[PDB]
């Protein structure tokens, strides 16, 4: 229990608001509800954001609290988050959910043909893995 904490340098993911879909770093904690929040490499200027808009990630940047923008930027680039992110599964599920919304009517036909074929080969061997795997003749 409790592994993803709010602290100085916690990389947060913004879920809604004007900066929805941006990674961002937590700089300081403004009184239980708001946080001084700065994303130097994801185009998000330093401002106050509530903790309900943001969602905590696994990555933690090391820098002292209330530091200037150029020190949270060269801490973003050391152990570079933008290649760590867009390699994790939660970053991949975001891009593989918006490109399902970026799916034209002709792309949706081509998935309709490729899925209907792929559910014939998979449906075939799950019969062969349950009528040959039931071959048991032992007491």
């Amino acid at each position: 229990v409790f592994r993803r904490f709010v602290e100085v340098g916690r990389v947060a993911y913004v879920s809604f608001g004007p900066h929805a879909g941006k990674l961002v770093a937590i700089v300081d904690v403004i009184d239980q509800n708001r946080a001084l929040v700065d994303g130097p490499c994801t185009q998000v200027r330093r401002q106050a954001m509530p903790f309900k808009c943001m969602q905590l990630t696994d990555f933690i940047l090391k820098f002292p609290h209330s530091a200037h923008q150029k020190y949270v930027r060269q801490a973003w680039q050391k152990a570079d988050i933008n290649t760590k992110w867009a390699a994790t599964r939660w970053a991949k599920k975001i891009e593989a959910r918006e490109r399902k919304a970026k799916m034209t009517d002709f792309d949706r036909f081509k998935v309709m043909k490729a899925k209907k074929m792929r559910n014939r080969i998979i449906k075939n061997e799950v019969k062969k893995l349950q009528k040959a795997a039931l071959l048991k003749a032992s007491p």
Partner: protein, 201 residues
């Protein structure tokens, strides 16, 4: 969309679910509320028990055969909360109220179906966890309902059959994770088309 909406009543708040149901009822939408044993009511037990005991005291003294009908089974307690949220003195609200079928537990029309959940009415979402809550199945028992003991023995044996169906549904699901490992060189074209267009992460 003219199928029936089936709602597992366990873990829901009484009037938060009733207001959701009584508006879907007015929009067509035959809805079936199963398992009323587990509907919660906010506030502690004794407080909520006193509300129902105070209702039992409302009674036409001239002839209580004509007065308020104090239904005691949980399903009919929930049926009355949505009654007061419908215009049941009109034919629009009586044809509405016929679309709702309420049951205690889960009868065998609906035991072999998937139940929907209303997150706007759940106890874990709409109450702070440092609060108290009463069970509608328990405050019916100490109020006059006869059948929580036969309902408990019929919901235990339904969950016996639910584990058996699940462990067969879960056994086929680990066969598809074996089949897709074997026949994968012959679906490399088809698994790349779906991976391109937002599916198959």
């Amino acid at each position: 969309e003219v199928q029936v909406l089936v709602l597992d009543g366990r873990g829901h708040l009484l009037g938060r679910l009733a207001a959701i149901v009584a508006k879907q009822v007015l929009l067509g939408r035959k809805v079936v509320v199963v398992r009323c044993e587990g509907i919660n009511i906010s506030g502690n037990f004794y407080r909520n028990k006193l509300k129902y005991l105070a209702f039992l005291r409302k009674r036409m003294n001239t002839n209580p055969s004509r007065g308020p009908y104090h239904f005691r089974a949980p399903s009919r307690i929930f049926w009355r909360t949505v009654r007061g949220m419908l215009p049941h003195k009109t034919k629009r609200g009586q044809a509405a109220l016929d679309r709702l079928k309420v049951f205690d537990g889960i009868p065998p029309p609906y035991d072999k179906k998937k139940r929907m959940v209303v997150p706007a009415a759940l106890k874990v979402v709409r109450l702070k966890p440092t609060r108290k809550f009463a069970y509608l199945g328990r405050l019916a028992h100490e109020v006059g309902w006869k059948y929580q003991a036969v309902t408990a023995t019929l919901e235990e044996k339904r969950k016996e059959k639910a584990k058996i169906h699940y462990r067969k549904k879960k056994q086929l699901m680990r066969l598809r994770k074996q089949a897709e490992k074997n026949v994968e060189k012959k679906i490399d074209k088809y698994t790349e088309v779906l991976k391109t267009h937002g599916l198959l992460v």
